[PDB]
mmCIF file of C-alpha atoms and ligand atoms in Angstrom:
data_model
loop_
_atom_site.group_PDB
_atom_site.id
_atom_site.type_symbol
_atom_site.label_atom_id
_atom_site.label_comp_id
_atom_site.label_asym_id
_atom_site.label_seq_id
_atom_site.Cartn_x
_atom_site.Cartn_y
_atom_site.Cartn_z
ATOM 1 C CA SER A 23 8.804 -14.628 6.448
ATOM 2 C CA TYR A 24 8.370 -17.634 8.828
ATOM 3 C CA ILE A 25 7.865 -18.850 12.411
ATOM 4 C CA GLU A 26 11.026 -19.404 14.539
ATOM 5 C CA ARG A 27 10.302 -21.717 17.487
ATOM 6 C CA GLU A 28 12.873 -22.224 20.243
ATOM 7 C CA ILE A 29 13.176 -22.998 23.987
ATOM 8 C CA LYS A 30 15.749 -20.990 26.035
ATOM 9 C CA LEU A 31 17.285 -22.431 29.273
ATOM 10 C CA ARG A 32 19.246 -20.342 31.812
ATOM 11 C CA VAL A 33 21.979 -22.820 32.884
ATOM 12 C CA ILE A 34 22.324 -23.315 36.674
ATOM 13 C CA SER A 35 24.742 -26.336 36.466
ATOM 14 C CA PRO A 36 27.057 -27.650 35.148
ATOM 15 C CA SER A 37 29.220 -25.077 33.257
ATOM 16 C CA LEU A 38 28.682 -24.838 29.491
ATOM 17 C CA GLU A 39 32.212 -26.235 29.079
ATOM 18 C CA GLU A 40 31.080 -29.386 31.017
ATOM 19 C CA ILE A 41 27.836 -29.527 28.956
ATOM 20 C CA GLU A 42 29.981 -29.427 25.759
ATOM 21 C CA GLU A 43 31.976 -32.362 27.157
ATOM 22 C CA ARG A 44 28.713 -34.275 27.925
ATOM 23 C CA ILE A 45 27.208 -33.761 24.421
ATOM 24 C CA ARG A 46 30.526 -33.837 22.462
ATOM 25 C CA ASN A 47 30.156 -37.602 21.717
ATOM 26 C CA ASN A 48 26.556 -37.817 20.336
ATOM 27 C CA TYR A 49 26.011 -34.251 19.022
ATOM 28 C CA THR A 50 27.713 -33.003 15.859
ATOM 29 C CA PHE A 51 29.513 -29.669 16.143
ATOM 30 C CA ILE A 52 28.401 -27.139 13.466
ATOM 31 C CA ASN A 53 30.284 -23.845 14.158
ATOM 32 C CA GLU A 54 31.061 -21.164 16.773
ATOM 33 C CA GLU A 55 29.467 -17.710 16.184
ATOM 34 C CA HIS A 56 30.703 -14.438 17.720
ATOM 35 C CA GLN A 57 27.489 -12.398 17.530
ATOM 36 C CA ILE A 58 27.240 -8.652 18.160
ATOM 37 C CA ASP A 59 23.642 -7.435 17.904
ATOM 38 C CA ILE A 60 22.305 -3.881 17.700
ATOM 39 C CA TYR A 61 18.603 -3.479 18.478
ATOM 40 C CA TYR A 62 16.443 -0.576 17.314
ATOM 41 C CA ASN A 63 13.190 1.124 18.301
ATOM 42 C CA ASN A 64 10.654 3.269 16.342
ATOM 43 C CA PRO A 65 10.038 6.701 17.951
ATOM 44 C CA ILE A 66 6.230 6.656 17.198
ATOM 45 C CA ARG A 67 5.528 2.858 17.529
ATOM 46 C CA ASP A 68 7.201 1.644 20.797
ATOM 47 C CA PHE A 69 8.377 -1.973 20.039
ATOM 48 C CA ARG A 70 8.271 -2.764 23.790
ATOM 49 C CA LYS A 71 4.459 -2.324 23.510
ATOM 50 C CA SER A 72 3.999 -4.216 20.177
ATOM 51 C CA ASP A 73 6.469 -6.995 21.222
ATOM 52 C CA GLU A 74 8.437 -6.469 17.993
ATOM 53 C CA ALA A 75 12.177 -6.145 17.363
ATOM 54 C CA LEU A 76 14.479 -4.824 14.618
ATOM 55 C CA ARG A 77 18.024 -6.203 14.895
ATOM 56 C CA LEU A 78 21.267 -5.707 12.971
ATOM 57 C CA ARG A 79 23.576 -8.639 13.713
ATOM 58 C CA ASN A 80 27.274 -9.177 13.016
ATOM 59 C CA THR A 81 27.962 -12.924 13.262
ATOM 60 C CA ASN A 82 31.529 -13.870 12.288
ATOM 61 C CA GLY A 83 31.517 -10.891 9.941
ATOM 62 C CA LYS A 84 28.225 -11.774 8.238
ATOM 63 C CA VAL A 85 25.706 -8.926 8.542
ATOM 64 C CA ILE A 86 22.036 -9.820 9.032
ATOM 65 C CA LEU A 87 19.004 -7.540 9.376
ATOM 66 C CA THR A 88 16.185 -9.281 11.236
ATOM 67 C CA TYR A 89 12.601 -8.235 12.063
ATOM 68 C CA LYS A 90 10.940 -10.271 14.860
ATOM 69 C CA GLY A 91 7.101 -10.243 15.266
ATOM 70 C CA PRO A 92 5.190 -10.599 18.611
ATOM 71 C CA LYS A 93 5.321 -13.893 20.582
ATOM 72 C CA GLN A 94 2.743 -16.516 19.596
ATOM 73 C CA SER A 95 3.194 -18.833 22.601
ATOM 74 C CA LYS A 96 3.562 -18.974 26.391
ATOM 75 C CA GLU A 97 5.223 -22.485 26.433
ATOM 76 C CA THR A 98 8.109 -21.654 23.991
ATOM 77 C CA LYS A 99 9.693 -18.614 22.285
ATOM 78 C CA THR A 100 7.641 -18.522 19.060
ATOM 79 C CA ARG A 101 7.779 -15.441 16.795
ATOM 80 C CA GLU A 102 7.599 -14.604 13.108
ATOM 81 C CA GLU A 103 11.222 -13.919 11.911
ATOM 82 C CA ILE A 104 12.247 -12.197 8.593
ATOM 83 C CA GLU A 105 16.012 -11.912 7.906
ATOM 84 C CA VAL A 106 18.100 -10.617 4.999
ATOM 85 C CA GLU A 107 21.860 -10.450 4.643
ATOM 86 C CA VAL A 108 23.156 -6.948 3.903
ATOM 87 C CA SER A 109 26.510 -5.879 2.514
ATOM 88 C CA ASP A 110 27.609 -3.195 4.996
ATOM 89 C CA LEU A 111 26.625 -2.884 8.717
ATOM 90 C CA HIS A 112 27.793 0.780 8.915
ATOM 91 C CA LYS A 113 25.622 1.821 5.929
ATOM 92 C CA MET A 114 22.599 -0.299 6.998
ATOM 93 C CA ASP A 115 22.891 1.328 10.454
ATOM 94 C CA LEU A 116 23.142 4.786 8.831
ATOM 95 C CA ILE A 117 20.053 4.074 6.649
ATOM 96 C CA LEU A 118 18.065 2.985 9.729
ATOM 97 C CA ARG A 119 19.149 6.118 11.678
ATOM 98 C CA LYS A 120 18.364 8.281 8.585
ATOM 99 C CA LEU A 121 14.843 6.742 8.458
ATOM 100 C CA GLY A 122 14.234 7.690 12.153
ATOM 101 C CA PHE A 123 15.095 4.408 13.988
ATOM 102 C CA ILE A 124 17.226 4.957 17.136
ATOM 103 C CA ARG A 125 19.753 2.397 18.516
ATOM 104 C CA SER A 126 18.102 1.094 21.751
ATOM 105 C CA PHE A 127 20.561 -1.575 22.940
ATOM 106 C CA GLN A 128 23.478 -3.975 22.223
ATOM 107 C CA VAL A 129 23.692 -7.784 22.982
ATOM 108 C CA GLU A 130 27.099 -9.535 22.496
ATOM 109 C CA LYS A 131 27.718 -13.324 22.726
ATOM 110 C CA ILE A 132 29.640 -16.475 21.756
ATOM 111 C CA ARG A 133 27.254 -19.221 20.513
ATOM 112 C CA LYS A 134 28.393 -22.829 19.852
ATOM 113 C CA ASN A 135 25.949 -24.691 17.552
ATOM 114 C CA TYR A 136 25.424 -28.512 17.773
ATOM 115 C CA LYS A 137 23.023 -30.662 15.736
ATOM 116 C CA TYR A 138 21.212 -33.865 16.831
ATOM 117 C CA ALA A 139 18.642 -35.469 14.438
ATOM 118 C CA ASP A 140 16.695 -32.286 13.291
ATOM 119 C CA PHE A 141 17.410 -30.305 16.510
ATOM 120 C CA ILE A 142 19.932 -27.395 16.787
ATOM 121 C CA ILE A 143 21.425 -26.908 20.329
ATOM 122 C CA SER A 144 23.139 -23.463 20.780
ATOM 123 C CA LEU A 145 25.414 -23.157 23.887
ATOM 124 C CA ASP A 146 25.231 -19.346 24.423
ATOM 125 C CA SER A 147 27.709 -17.381 26.661
ATOM 126 C CA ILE A 148 26.036 -13.914 26.796
ATOM 127 C CA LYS A 149 28.381 -11.022 27.792
ATOM 128 C CA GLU A 150 27.087 -9.618 31.218
ATOM 129 C CA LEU A 151 24.191 -12.102 31.496
ATOM 130 C CA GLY A 152 25.640 -15.606 31.864
ATOM 131 C CA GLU A 153 25.418 -19.068 30.301
ATOM 132 C CA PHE A 154 22.270 -20.165 28.414
ATOM 133 C CA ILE A 155 21.185 -22.907 26.022
ATOM 134 C CA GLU A 156 18.759 -22.495 23.120
ATOM 135 C CA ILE A 157 17.156 -25.381 21.229
ATOM 136 C CA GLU A 158 15.310 -25.188 17.867
ATOM 137 C CA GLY A 159 13.619 -28.032 15.966
ATOM 138 C CA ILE A 160 13.606 -28.359 12.154
ATOM 139 C CA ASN A 161 9.975 -29.009 11.014
ATOM 140 C CA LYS A 162 8.999 -29.786 14.640
ATOM 141 C CA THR A 163 5.728 -29.065 16.537
ATOM 142 C CA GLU A 164 5.773 -27.181 19.874
ATOM 143 C CA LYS A 165 5.079 -30.586 21.537
ATOM 144 C CA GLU A 166 8.052 -32.220 19.758
ATOM 145 C CA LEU A 167 10.390 -29.399 20.791
ATOM 146 C CA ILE A 168 9.214 -29.416 24.414
ATOM 147 C CA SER A 169 9.637 -33.194 24.577
ATOM 148 C CA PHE A 170 13.149 -33.161 23.111
ATOM 149 C CA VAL A 171 14.333 -30.440 25.498
ATOM 150 C CA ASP A 172 13.021 -32.462 28.443
ATOM 151 C CA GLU A 173 14.991 -35.462 27.172
ATOM 152 C CA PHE A 174 18.021 -33.241 26.523
ATOM 153 C CA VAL A 175 18.289 -31.784 30.031
ATOM 154 C CA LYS A 176 17.638 -35.159 31.673
ATOM 155 C CA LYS A 177 20.160 -37.152 29.558
ATOM 156 C CA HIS A 178 22.940 -34.640 30.392
ATOM 157 C CA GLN A 179 22.034 -33.910 34.073
ATOM 158 C CA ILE A 180 21.526 -30.138 33.450
ATOM 159 C CA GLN A 181 19.991 -28.021 36.241
ATOM 160 C CA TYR A 182 18.142 -25.246 34.411
ATOM 161 C CA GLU A 183 15.396 -22.651 34.265
ATOM 162 C CA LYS A 184 13.124 -22.098 31.163
ATOM 163 C CA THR A 185 12.326 -18.544 29.945
ATOM 164 C CA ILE A 186 10.559 -17.137 26.842
ATOM 165 C CA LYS A 187 12.215 -13.728 27.407
ATOM 166 C CA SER A 188 14.671 -12.355 24.812
ATOM 167 C CA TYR A 189 18.333 -11.737 25.759
ATOM 168 C CA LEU A 190 17.542 -8.011 25.319
ATOM 169 C CA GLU A 191 14.659 -8.268 27.818
ATOM 170 C CA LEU A 192 16.746 -10.282 30.323
ATOM 171 C CA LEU A 193 19.775 -7.989 30.100
ATOM 172 C CA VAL A 194 17.528 -4.981 30.948
ATOM 173 C CA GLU A 195 16.180 -6.872 33.967
ATOM 174 C CA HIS A 196 19.725 -7.899 35.058
ATOM 175 C CA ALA A 197 20.894 -4.225 34.998
ATOM 176 C CA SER B 2 27.273 7.642 3.023
ATOM 177 C CA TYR B 3 28.337 10.059 0.208
ATOM 178 C CA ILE B 4 27.281 12.734 -2.301
ATOM 179 C CA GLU B 5 26.008 11.523 -5.728
ATOM 180 C CA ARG B 6 26.231 14.305 -8.331
ATOM 181 C CA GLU B 7 24.640 13.895 -11.760
ATOM 182 C CA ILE B 8 23.018 15.902 -14.598
ATOM 183 C CA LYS B 9 19.837 14.462 -16.228
ATOM 184 C CA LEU B 10 18.861 15.380 -19.851
ATOM 185 C CA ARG B 11 15.419 14.677 -21.371
ATOM 186 C CA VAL B 12 16.361 13.718 -24.970
ATOM 187 C CA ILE B 13 14.483 15.646 -27.707
ATOM 188 C CA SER B 14 16.655 14.376 -30.655
ATOM 189 C CA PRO B 15 18.132 12.145 -31.944
ATOM 190 C CA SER B 16 16.870 8.730 -30.672
ATOM 191 C CA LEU B 17 18.965 7.033 -27.977
ATOM 192 C CA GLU B 18 19.798 4.351 -30.565
ATOM 193 C CA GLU B 19 21.340 7.118 -32.785
ATOM 194 C CA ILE B 20 23.140 8.610 -29.731
ATOM 195 C CA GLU B 21 24.616 5.124 -29.025
ATOM 196 C CA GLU B 22 25.840 5.049 -32.636
ATOM 197 C CA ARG B 23 27.397 8.557 -32.230
ATOM 198 C CA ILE B 24 29.263 7.706 -28.975
ATOM 199 C CA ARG B 25 29.980 4.007 -29.791
ATOM 200 C CA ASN B 26 33.472 4.855 -31.193
ATOM 201 C CA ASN B 27 34.984 7.021 -28.377
ATOM 202 C CA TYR B 28 32.994 5.825 -25.319
ATOM 203 C CA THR B 29 33.602 2.418 -23.743
ATOM 204 C CA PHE B 30 30.512 0.289 -23.141
ATOM 205 C CA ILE B 31 30.230 -0.936 -19.505
ATOM 206 C CA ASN B 32 26.921 -2.897 -19.216
ATOM 207 C CA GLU B 33 23.138 -2.767 -19.764
ATOM 208 C CA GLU B 34 20.967 -2.700 -16.587
ATOM 209 C CA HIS B 35 17.277 -3.679 -16.435
ATOM 210 C CA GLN B 36 16.238 -1.742 -13.321
ATOM 211 C CA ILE B 37 12.922 -2.154 -11.499
ATOM 212 C CA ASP B 38 12.634 0.262 -8.571
ATOM 213 C CA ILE B 39 10.120 0.310 -5.718
ATOM 214 C CA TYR B 40 9.891 3.583 -3.794
ATOM 215 C CA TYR B 41 8.580 3.926 -0.242
ATOM 216 C CA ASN B 42 7.128 6.625 2.006
ATOM 217 C CA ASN B 43 6.943 7.026 5.836
ATOM 218 C CA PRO B 44 3.356 7.523 7.117
ATOM 219 C CA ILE B 45 4.397 10.156 9.773
ATOM 220 C CA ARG B 46 7.332 11.865 7.906
ATOM 221 C CA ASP B 47 6.137 12.632 4.309
ATOM 222 C CA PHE B 48 9.290 12.202 2.091
ATOM 223 C CA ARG B 49 7.737 14.544 -0.520
ATOM 224 C CA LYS B 50 8.115 17.315 2.122
ATOM 225 C CA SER B 51 11.643 16.338 3.345
ATOM 226 C CA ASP B 52 12.880 15.651 -0.248
ATOM 227 C CA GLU B 53 14.062 12.179 0.815
ATOM 228 C CA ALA B 54 13.619 8.772 -0.824
ATOM 229 C CA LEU B 55 13.835 5.097 0.191
ATOM 230 C CA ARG B 56 14.247 2.776 -2.807
ATOM 231 C CA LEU B 57 14.499 -0.988 -3.287
ATOM 232 C CA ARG B 58 16.059 -1.674 -6.689
ATOM 233 C CA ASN B 59 16.348 -4.865 -8.735
ATOM 234 C CA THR B 60 19.088 -4.323 -11.338
ATOM 235 C CA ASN B 61 19.885 -7.457 -13.365
ATOM 236 C CA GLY B 62 18.888 -9.493 -10.324
ATOM 237 C CA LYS B 63 21.077 -7.578 -7.863
ATOM 238 C CA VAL B 64 19.003 -6.131 -5.008
ATOM 239 C CA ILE B 65 19.971 -2.711 -3.640
ATOM 240 C CA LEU B 66 18.401 -0.687 -0.819
ATOM 241 C CA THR B 67 19.115 3.021 -1.232
ATOM 242 C CA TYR B 68 18.328 6.063 0.948
ATOM 243 C CA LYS B 69 18.557 9.438 -0.865
ATOM 244 C CA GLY B 70 18.864 12.713 1.157
ATOM 245 C CA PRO B 71 17.471 16.159 0.085
ATOM 246 C CA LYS B 72 18.921 17.974 -2.973
ATOM 247 C CA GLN B 73 21.970 20.157 -2.311
ATOM 248 C CA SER B 74 21.989 22.035 -5.639
ATOM 249 C CA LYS B 75 19.825 23.854 -8.195
ATOM 250 C CA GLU B 76 22.353 23.448 -11.117
ATOM 251 C CA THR B 77 22.694 19.600 -10.895
ATOM 252 C CA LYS B 78 21.037 16.628 -9.138
ATOM 253 C CA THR B 79 23.157 16.472 -5.960
ATOM 254 C CA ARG B 80 22.009 14.335 -3.001
ATOM 255 C CA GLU B 81 23.529 12.245 -0.235
ATOM 256 C CA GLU B 82 23.149 8.529 -1.268
ATOM 257 C CA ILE B 83 23.569 5.455 1.056
ATOM 258 C CA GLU B 84 23.188 2.006 -0.584
ATOM 259 C CA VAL B 85 23.551 -1.581 0.639
ATOM 260 C CA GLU B 86 23.070 -4.814 -1.261
ATOM 261 C CA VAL B 87 20.522 -7.145 0.340
ATOM 262 C CA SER B 88 19.988 -10.851 -0.210
ATOM 263 C CA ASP B 89 16.232 -11.051 -0.865
ATOM 264 C CA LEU B 90 13.950 -8.308 -2.340
ATOM 265 C CA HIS B 91 10.742 -10.064 -1.135
ATOM 266 C CA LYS B 92 11.983 -10.236 2.490
ATOM 267 C CA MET B 93 13.493 -6.701 2.461
ATOM 268 C CA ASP B 94 10.128 -5.455 1.118
ATOM 269 C CA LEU B 95 8.287 -7.426 3.835
ATOM 270 C CA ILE B 96 10.590 -5.979 6.558
ATOM 271 C CA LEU B 97 9.947 -2.430 5.287
ATOM 272 C CA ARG B 98 6.149 -3.025 5.205
ATOM 273 C CA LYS B 99 6.354 -4.645 8.696
ATOM 274 C CA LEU B 100 8.175 -1.517 9.992
ATOM 275 C CA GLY B 101 5.345 0.751 8.662
ATOM 276 C CA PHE B 102 6.757 1.907 5.264
ATOM 277 C CA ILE B 103 4.159 1.794 2.436
ATOM 278 C CA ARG B 104 5.018 1.190 -1.271
ATOM 279 C CA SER B 105 4.404 4.610 -2.949
ATOM 280 C CA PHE B 106 5.470 3.982 -6.562
ATOM 281 C CA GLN B 107 7.371 1.878 -9.158
ATOM 282 C CA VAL B 108 9.929 3.094 -11.823
ATOM 283 C CA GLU B 109 11.105 0.560 -14.489
ATOM 284 C CA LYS B 110 13.898 1.158 -17.065
ATOM 285 C CA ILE B 111 16.692 -0.100 -19.338
ATOM 286 C CA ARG B 112 19.962 1.820 -18.702
ATOM 287 C CA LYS B 113 23.055 1.470 -20.952
ATOM 288 C CA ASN B 114 26.248 2.633 -19.167
ATOM 289 C CA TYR B 115 29.240 4.146 -21.085
ATOM 290 C CA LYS B 116 32.502 5.491 -19.640
ATOM 291 C CA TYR B 117 34.681 8.350 -20.987
ATOM 292 C CA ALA B 118 37.741 9.497 -18.931
ATOM 293 C CA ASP B 119 36.165 9.607 -15.362
ATOM 294 C CA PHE B 120 32.594 10.296 -16.617
ATOM 295 C CA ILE B 121 29.740 7.697 -16.666
ATOM 296 C CA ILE B 122 27.056 8.323 -19.389
ATOM 297 C CA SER B 123 23.793 6.327 -18.775
ATOM 298 C CA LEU B 124 21.394 6.138 -21.795
ATOM 299 C CA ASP B 125 18.070 5.606 -19.920
ATOM 300 C CA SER B 126 14.826 4.357 -21.632
ATOM 301 C CA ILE B 127 12.232 4.880 -18.833
ATOM 302 C CA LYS B 128 8.997 2.819 -19.217
ATOM 303 C CA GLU B 129 6.063 5.369 -19.735
ATOM 304 C CA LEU B 130 8.307 8.462 -19.566
ATOM 305 C CA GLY B 131 10.669 8.403 -22.553
ATOM 306 C CA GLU B 132 14.376 8.607 -23.387
ATOM 307 C CA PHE B 133 16.821 10.360 -21.017
ATOM 308 C CA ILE B 134 20.568 10.613 -20.456
ATOM 309 C CA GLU B 135 22.299 10.851 -17.075
ATOM 310 C CA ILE B 136 25.944 11.828 -16.588
ATOM 311 C CA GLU B 137 28.033 11.408 -13.394
ATOM 312 C CA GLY B 138 31.663 12.438 -12.826
ATOM 313 C CA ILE B 139 34.159 10.444 -10.722
ATOM 314 C CA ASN B 140 35.882 12.878 -8.270
ATOM 315 C CA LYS B 141 34.521 15.840 -10.288
ATOM 316 C CA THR B 142 33.318 19.303 -9.109
ATOM 317 C CA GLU B 143 29.856 20.614 -10.096
ATOM 318 C CA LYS B 144 31.696 22.947 -12.548
ATOM 319 C CA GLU B 145 33.601 20.020 -14.122
ATOM 320 C CA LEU B 146 30.403 18.004 -14.563
ATOM 321 C CA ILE B 147 28.467 20.930 -16.047
ATOM 322 C CA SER B 148 31.319 21.646 -18.463
ATOM 323 C CA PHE B 149 31.633 18.035 -19.627
ATOM 324 C CA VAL B 150 27.891 17.707 -20.255
ATOM 325 C CA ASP B 151 27.970 20.881 -22.352
ATOM 326 C CA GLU B 152 30.814 19.380 -24.391
ATOM 327 C CA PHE B 153 28.976 16.044 -24.563
ATOM 328 C CA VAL B 154 25.720 17.381 -26.016
ATOM 329 C CA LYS B 155 27.544 19.660 -28.464
ATOM 330 C CA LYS B 156 29.998 17.000 -29.771
ATOM 331 C CA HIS B 157 27.097 14.601 -30.521
ATOM 332 C CA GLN B 158 24.492 17.154 -31.789
ATOM 333 C CA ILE B 159 21.927 16.255 -29.052
ATOM 334 C CA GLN B 160 18.832 18.467 -28.659
ATOM 335 C CA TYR B 161 17.967 18.230 -24.963
ATOM 336 C CA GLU B 162 16.391 19.676 -21.845
ATOM 337 C CA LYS B 163 18.103 19.646 -18.359
ATOM 338 C CA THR B 164 16.104 18.709 -15.216
ATOM 339 C CA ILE B 165 17.063 18.058 -11.558
ATOM 340 C CA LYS B 166 13.770 16.179 -10.997
ATOM 341 C CA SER B 167 13.834 12.449 -10.135
ATOM 342 C CA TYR B 168 12.245 9.893 -12.507
ATOM 343 C CA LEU B 169 9.651 9.332 -9.740
ATOM 344 C CA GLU B 170 8.818 13.064 -9.684
ATOM 345 C CA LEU B 171 8.646 13.287 -13.506
ATOM 346 C CA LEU B 172 6.502 10.168 -13.891
ATOM 347 C CA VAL B 173 3.940 11.654 -11.432
ATOM 348 C CA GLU B 174 3.878 14.866 -13.481
ATOM 349 C CA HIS B 175 3.532 12.901 -16.772
ATOM 350 C CA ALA B 176 0.467 10.999 -15.409
HETATM 351 CA CA1 LIG C 15 17.151 -16.949 20.475
HETATM 352 CA CA1 LIG C 16 19.669 9.269 -11.515
#
C-alpha cells in the first residue's frame, strides 16, 4: 500500500497529437494503454462521502483491482493506492457483486506514457470528456512534482487547467 | 462462477499414510499442496447466517481469492464457487480490510491430490483437526459421486464418517 502523487491538466491547446510531436524528441515513449475501468460503491459506506474508490481496470488485457484512499492534498492528486493483478475480470466482478458491491460507473480511455528523468507523462484521451495530461514523479516531493509540471507546460507552450478531481468525478460533472 | 461438488470423510482408520500406500498402485499422484487459508466476514451481512464464505488462500505460493455460495445439498458438499488468482496476498488482504472485511479465522493444511478416472481424491491433514479425505468428480452427478465414494472406502477398507461441514465450521466445533 503506498502514496500515488500526480498532477492532472485539462488540455486547452494544442491538441494531444501536437503535444506528442513537441515532446517526441526529448521524452522516451513507454507504451500506449487502452484502459476500461469499472468503478464500484458500497451500499452501506458511500465512497462519495469517504472519498474512496474501488476500481477494476482492463489495460491492454491486464486486469487490475485497485483501492484508492481519500485525497491527502489540495495542490496535487495525492491518495493511498493498493493494486493487485487478478486473473479474470468477469469472475472478480462477479465476486465483488456477490459481496454486495454495485457497479457505479465506467471510464474508458487511451493513455500514451512518456518518461523524462524520473517523471512519467501520460497523454490521456478520455472517451466523452476530452484530452488531459497526467504527470507522476518517481521518489519526488509535492514541490518537485509541481515544479516539473510548471517547466513541462512552459517548455511545450501548453495552455492548460489544473484539477485534483478524478476522471470519474469530472465525467459526472460533464454529464 | 460454477458448482463445486465434493464429499468429505473424517478418517477413523487407517492412517492417511496407510491409505496412500493402499491407493498408490491404482491412483495417479498429482501434487502435494501446503494450503494456508484466511477466511473473512462482512460486518453488516453475517456470512454464518447466509452460509457464504470469502477466502484468501496461499497454496504452494499461489494466491487465490475464492467466494463460496450457500450449500445446495444435504447429501454432499455442494456450493457455488468463484475463484481468481491474485498477484499479492498482503495487498489483497489490505484491500479487503480497507473495504471493511475483517479476518475471521485461519485454516492450515497439507493436501495430497490423487486422480482416478475423472475423480480427484485429496488426502487432507488439517492442522489441529486431524486426517480427512475429500473426493470431487469431474462432470459427475451427485449420484455418481456418492457411488464412487462408497466404492472407494470399501475397496481400501477405510473406516470413516461423512460430513458436509467446512473445515472452518469443524475447527470452531473442535475448539
Ligand atoms: Ca490519474
Ligand atoms: Ca473442500
